[PDB]
């Protein structure tokens, strides 16, 4: 036969993956179905532009919430492609593609600045961005070695100091590989915004933690104790608005997570050249999901 055998290579775009919006909608459903606020205040506007605060009061039961691993499976008629290329930056064509019935097991965590309990890179650290040139595009950092962070809930979480320092070190190197070897890398704390954005915030065991992460993002070419506090009144992530959750059930609340990634932003401007500044980012949970689904692409079977 003259016919030739060929592997089927598809094009990927982790930035325009419908699996992300789908998961985002699923996470939101699972939450409202298990952790709803006692009072929810959300802005309600009309055409002209006049708005009024909407207040919703409902039962807000609290129960020990344990991580339920989930994954996405292909419905009859479609298949889930998986890019297995090394250092896959998340876009363009993939040479070594495979198929799976469902995605790997995921333990979805809502957080900002740091990605917790996610998947690690097999080779070295990899940084991905929809457009590095654009300083308005978030940079997702996928570590290849997790860093344990334990919160004794006693108002502070602890991390290895040299291990976190080694992490910034390797991350900075990867940034040089993407912006220039002679450029100087510098990490600075958030420039501001809501507390969830300014601090490293995450939900653990159904509680909303806010940790001061200044000691973590102050660097330039033992343990690290971060001051953290639990809040009942916060800003929602599922939608714009404020909410109030019930006080903690258990007496002492602890939390042990693996730092598998980070969300950064680079300071733009043509000012002060030769150096790049990166601060902790995040806020749009879609990027949190995207950090786990970047290697998948659902395509119609044919």
């Amino acid at each position, epitope marked *: 036969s003259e016919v030739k055998l060929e592997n089927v290579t598809e094009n990927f775009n982790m930035w325009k993956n419908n699996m992300v919006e789908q998961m985002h909608e699923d996470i939101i459903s699972l939450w409202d179905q298990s952790l709803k606020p006692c009072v929810k205040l959300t802005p309600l506007c009309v055409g002209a532009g006049s708005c009024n605060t909407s207040v919703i*009061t409902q039962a807000c039961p609290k129960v020990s919430f344990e991580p339920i691993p989930i994954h996405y499976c292909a419905p009859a008629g479609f298949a889930i492609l998986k890019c297995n290329d090394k250092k896959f930056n998340g876009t363009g064509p993939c040479t070594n593609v495979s198929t799976v019935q469902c995605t790997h097991g995921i333990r979805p965590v809502v957080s900002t600045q740091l990605l917790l309990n996610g998947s690690l890179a097999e080779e070295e650290i990899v940084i991905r961005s929809e457009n590095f040139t654009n300083n308005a595009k978030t940079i997702i950092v996928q570590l290849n070695e997790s860093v344990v962070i334990n919160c004794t809930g006693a108002g502070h979480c602890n991390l290895s100091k040299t291990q976190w320092e080694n992490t910034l070190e390797q991350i900075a190197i990867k940034l040089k590989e993407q912006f220039g070897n002679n450029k100087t890398i510098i990490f600075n704390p958030s420039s501001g915004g809501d507390p969830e954005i300014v601090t490293h915030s995450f939900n653990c065991g159904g509680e909303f933690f806010y940790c001061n992460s200044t000691q973590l993002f102050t660097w330039n070419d033992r343990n690290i104790t971060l001051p953290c506090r639990i809040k009942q009144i916060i800003n929602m992530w599922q939608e714009v608005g404020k909410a109030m959750y019930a*006080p903690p059930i258990r007496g002492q609340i602890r939390c042990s997570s693996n730092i598998t990634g980070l969300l950064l932003t680079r300071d733009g401007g043509k000012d002060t050249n030769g150096t790049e500044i990166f601060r902790p980012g995040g806020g749009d949970m879609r990027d949190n999901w995207r950090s786990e689904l970047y290697k998948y692409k659902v395509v119609k079977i044919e």
Partner: antibody
Amino acid sequence: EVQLVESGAEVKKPGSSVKVSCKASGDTFIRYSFTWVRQAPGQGLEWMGRIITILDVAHYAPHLQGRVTITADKSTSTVYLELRNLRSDDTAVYFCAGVYEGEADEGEYDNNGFLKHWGQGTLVTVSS
Amino acid sequence: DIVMTQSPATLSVSPGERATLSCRASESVSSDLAWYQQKPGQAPRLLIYGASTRATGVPARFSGSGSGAEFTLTISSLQSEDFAVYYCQQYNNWPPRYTFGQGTRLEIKR
């Protein structure tokens, strides 16, 4: 040092409306939630409603049918109870009360439903 | 919705003696139960909260116990200042619909 002072006795005619004030002093206002309790002559206490100051959200007792509104003025650190279309059986002493909720300004809130501090009460007589 | 019933309506006891008041909820209210004391012509004073926690400034002879739908307020040694009306209050439901008991008048037995 945390005290609650209510405005003086009032006499109203049926169909009129009355607004009772409750001045709070002694601590960070936004860190307390306030409740209004009424007591008709010779009867027991009745929970009317409670306002979560920092959030500026008030919850009410059922059978009030929007004839009552509880508001707070952060500026004067004052709580108000507005009762409309007054009936003679609205006659009673209205009590203003509150409790500490924690560092609400820092996002912490206990949402305690009991009443530690109480105002002296305001007699409201509705009669033609 | 949640009815609090106090009993007896009137309790007569000799001074220096011990009195035990009873309050019952039409359904579990957990420990969100408080007790208050009120003298004629005066504002109510908070005695116990959290079903068993005694508020600051409240004499040591006052104590509360119970949980769920059964609570009791104990006054080990009645003093002249303790004869008045006592009310219980639940604040466990949400959306909040807090309710008081109709009270128990404690009078001196002679």
